[PDB]
């Protein structure tokens, strides 16, 4: 626990139970382009291209693609401000960030509603995410629903 | 009976255990195995240093030769005549093999040749049914079925029929 490159890693760089071994082919078949969104997860079975332990699990953006490295931009919290960092990692340490898929589907579907309303004279009725407000009203039936009486009950010791 | 259920002889092994520091006792005994069958000898070394047996580590001790084919029948039929085709009951293993040993190789039928000397050896045989390539190949490796493995009493049957002999 002195100040080194790999300090205090006992449960962060341990491979989980019944999952040892070299990774598979579905990692290597993926591609990355400039402007995507990528999270970082260390696979502790290769020793060429590991980043520092601080960046384990933070999402960034991809700006360059090299023959052996990918470039990711991030944000670190140095004493006062929020700065800008760049790192080069290998392909076996990344993962495609989901979470824009429900957003990018909403872009493609709203773009279709705008197109069909050009042929008509109506105003646009876009798709936006729902809101939750006060509790709405409902209707209960007392034909098949019977109330159950609830009351207190005397205390009984466990033995 | 299906002819794939037969029993045969896979291989035979011979071992001469000499223990010494002299190469002349090795190279004399190395000519005897070549004189018996045309294969060449294969040496063996030590694992540790044991003063009680006169053994130092990484040093030659003994020789052994693995033989097969129909040549193994001629060596086996000679060796059974020394014990008058009589064997015990406990020579058979769990898996099926057995063995024996003779104190003198002159009883096998070679000449004296006194500078070579007199040695002794012990033999061991293997029995396998057809279909043993399954656990031995590289591609498509697998286990053997439970129906085809030889037991102790299967060696007690096949020994008496192929060699009319007495069990003790």
């Amino acid at each position: 626990s002195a100040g080194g490159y790999r300090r205090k890693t006992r449960q962060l760089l341990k491979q989980p139970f019944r999952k040892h071994g070299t990774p598979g082919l579905s990692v290597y078949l993926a591609t990355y382009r400039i402007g995507d969104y990528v999270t970082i997860s260390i696979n502790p079975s290769i020793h060429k291209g590991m980043p520092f332990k601080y960046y384990h699990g933070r999402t960034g953006r991809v700006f360059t693609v090299n023959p052996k490295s990918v470039g990711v931009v991030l944000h670190k919290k140095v004493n006062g401000r929020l700065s800008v960092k760049t790192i080069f990692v290998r392909v076996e340490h990344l993962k495609k960030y989901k979470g824009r898929d429900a957003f990018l589907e909403r872009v493609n579907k709203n773009n279709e509603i705008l197109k069909e309303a050009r042929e008509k004279g109506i105003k646009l009725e876009y798709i936006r995410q729902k809101e939750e407000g006060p509790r709405e009203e409902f209707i209960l039936n007392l034909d098949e629903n019977k109330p159950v009486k609830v009351g207190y009950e005397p205390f009984i010791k466990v033995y | 009976i299906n002819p794939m259920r037969e029993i045969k002889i896979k291989k035979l092994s011979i071992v001469i255990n000499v223990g010494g520091g002299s190469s002349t006792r090795l190279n004399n005994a190395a000519k005897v195995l070549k004189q018996l069958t045309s294969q060449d000898c294969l040496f063996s070394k030590a694992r540790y240093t044991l003063r009680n047996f006169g053994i130092r580590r990484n040093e030659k001790i003994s020789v052994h030769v693995n033989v097969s084919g129909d040549k193994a029948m001629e060596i086996l039929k000679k060796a059974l005549k020394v014990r008058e085709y009589e064997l015990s009951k406990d020579c058979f293993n769990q898996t099926g093999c057995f063995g024996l040993g003779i104190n003198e190789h002159i009883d096998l039928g070679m000449k004296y040749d006194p500078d070579i000397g007199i040695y002794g050896m012990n033999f061991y045989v293997d029995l396998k049914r057809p279909g043993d390539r399954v656990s031995k190949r590289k591609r498509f490796r697998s286990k053997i079925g439970n129906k085809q493995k030889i037991s102790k009493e299967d060696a007690q049957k096949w020994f008496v029929d192929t060699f009319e002999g007495i069990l003790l």
Binding site: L25, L29, T31, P67, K68 | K138, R139, R141, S142
Partner: protein, 282 residues
């Protein structure tokens, strides 16, 4: 001092295709790697495998859900050209990949620009034309078989280079090569055609008439003479350059085959069989 149950719970089971002893996963990943800049360019690979009585050759390109074939060739297709006595020989590996690479280019219409050469046996690698498209690129999968000098797998990549498809290889694993000498091209030509098979057949007749009728019985039963084999083999290669097309089969329906199928026993028959087993004891 562990139990029998803890020894099963701590077990890590290997992959399914490794469990059946069919592949080497470290050898596969090094073959299908790619630099990250070439996203749109997928690699090719040629697979050369043999069964106990056949030769299978495929050209594939890999994907995430699974592989896909581009063009295939089977050694049992050579009855259409007249070779049906030897389906596993040194010639049988050569003509199969030769039909494979000739069939792939006809899907891409490069047959006119890149045509076949004559089977001389000289060590050559095809090159590019000055203005048109460059040649196609294919790598080789050896599988699990060991690599020797005169192997049958290495002659199948010789058949792909003669069709015109560019394959990087060197002449060190051929027959008739020795170090620091020019390559003996005519000695390789005697193993491509089945000359060693014919001279073994001629030797057996005067030497052992009994053993010869056992070993070459289909060569006896068909009316095949040893002194004329390479006249038939050379005529077989000429039909592939004329027409490489397949022949279609009509599609029948096989649903009457369903009767050789055993379902699982249901829950009602499972609970019924238990009480009859308990009945016989009391």
């Amino acid at each position: 001092a562990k139990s029998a149950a803890t020894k099963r719970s701590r077990f890590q089971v290997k992959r399914r295709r490794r469990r059946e002893c069919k592949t080497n996963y470290r050898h596969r990943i090094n073959l299908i790697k790619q630099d990250y800049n070439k996203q749109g360019a997928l690699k090719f690979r040629l697979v050369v495998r043999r069964t106990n009585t056949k030769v299978i050759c495929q050209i594939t390109r890999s994907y995430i859900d699974g592989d896909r074939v581009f063009a295939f060739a089977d050694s049992t297709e050579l009855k259409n050209y007249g070779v049906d006595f030897g389906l596993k020989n040194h010639f049988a590996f050569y003509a199969t990949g030769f039909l494979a690479a000739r069939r792939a280019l006809a899907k891409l219409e490069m047959d006119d620009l890149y045509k076949a050469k004559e089977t001389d046996g000289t060590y050559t690698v095809t090159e590019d034309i000055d203005e048109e498209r460059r040649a196609l690129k294919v790598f080789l999968d050896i599988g699990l078989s060991r690599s020797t000098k005169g192997g049958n797998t290495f002659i199948a990549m010789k058949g792909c280079s003669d069709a015109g498809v560019y394959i990087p290889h060197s002449e060190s694993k051929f027959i008739g090569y020795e170090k620091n000498k020019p390559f003996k091209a005519d000695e390789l030509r005697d193993r491509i055609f089945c000359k060693h098979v014919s001279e073994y057949m001629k030797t057996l007749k005067e030497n052992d008439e009994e053993k010869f009728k056992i070993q070459f019985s289909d060569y006896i039963k068909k009316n095949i003479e040893p002194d004329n084999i390479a006249g038939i083999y050379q005529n077989a290669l000429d039909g592939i350059i004329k027409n490489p097309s397949r022949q279609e089969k009509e599609k029948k329906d096989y649903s009457g085959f369903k009767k050789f199928k055993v379902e699982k026993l249901s829950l009602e028959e499972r609970k019924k069989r238990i009480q009859e087993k308990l009945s016989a004891l009391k």
